[PDB]
């Protein structure tokens, strides 16, 4: 589990969104596994605005943060997981690393802020849903 809290936005994996998230929806995209809901309280996370390909992610199933290199956001074929069939997922970045379903929502961060959240795992790879292109998170 996990979210990003920026301004009056909460960013979560679409497959983990709550009723309250859907009841306060701003934007969602199944192909990216993202959903954004509105918040009453201001959040303090900063979204990275950059093309970094190195950073650190949180892996809850190891209670550890791992430094990783990660690929550019792309349309990637993902094998079946416990929460999606095998399919193409968009805006996804891969690294070599551990990721199980409970790790979804863990933050990937670079020097500029939050890059994205864990979304995929298996075959020794971890996939992150990028948020750096969602420039509207920075305003309004
Ligand atoms: Zn960066």
Curated annotation (Swiss-Prot):
The chain holds residues 869 to 1008 of 2193 of the full protein. The lineage of its organism: Viruses, Riboviria, Orthornavirae, Pisuviricota, Pisoniviricetes. This is Protease 2A. The active site is at residues 15, 33, 104. Homodimer. Cysteine protease that cleaves viral polyprotein and specific host proteins. It is responsible for the autocatalytic cleavage between the P1 and P2 regions, which is the first cleavage occurring in the polyprotein. Also cleaves the host translation initiation factor EIF4G1, in order to shut down the capped cellular mRNA translation. Inhibits the host nucleus-cytoplasm protein and RNA trafficking by cleaving host members of the nuclear pores. Counteracts stress granule formation probably by antagonizing its assembly or promoting its dissassembly. It catalyses: Selective cleavage of Tyr-|-Gly bond in the picornavirus polyprotein. Zn(2+) 1 binds at residues 50, 52, 110, 112.
């Amino acid at each position: 589990s996990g979210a990003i809290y920026v301004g009056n936005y909460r960013v979560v994996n679409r497959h983990l969104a709550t009723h309250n998230d859907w009841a306060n929806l701003v934007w969602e995209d199944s192909s990216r596994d993202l959903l954004v809901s509105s918040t009453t309280a201001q959040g303090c996370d900063t979204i990275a605005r950059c093309d970094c390909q190195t950073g650190v992610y949180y892996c809850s199933s190891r209670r550890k943060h791992y430094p990783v290199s990660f690929s550019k956001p792309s349309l990637i074929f993902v094998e079946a997981s416990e929460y999606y069939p095998a399919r193409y997922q968009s805006h996804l970045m891969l690294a070599v690393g551990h990721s199980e379903p409970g790790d979804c929502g863990g933050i990937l961060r670079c020097q500029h802020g939050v890059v994205g959240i864990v979304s995929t795992g298996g075959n020794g790879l971890v996939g992150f849903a990028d948020v750096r292109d969602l420039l509207w998170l920075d305003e309004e």
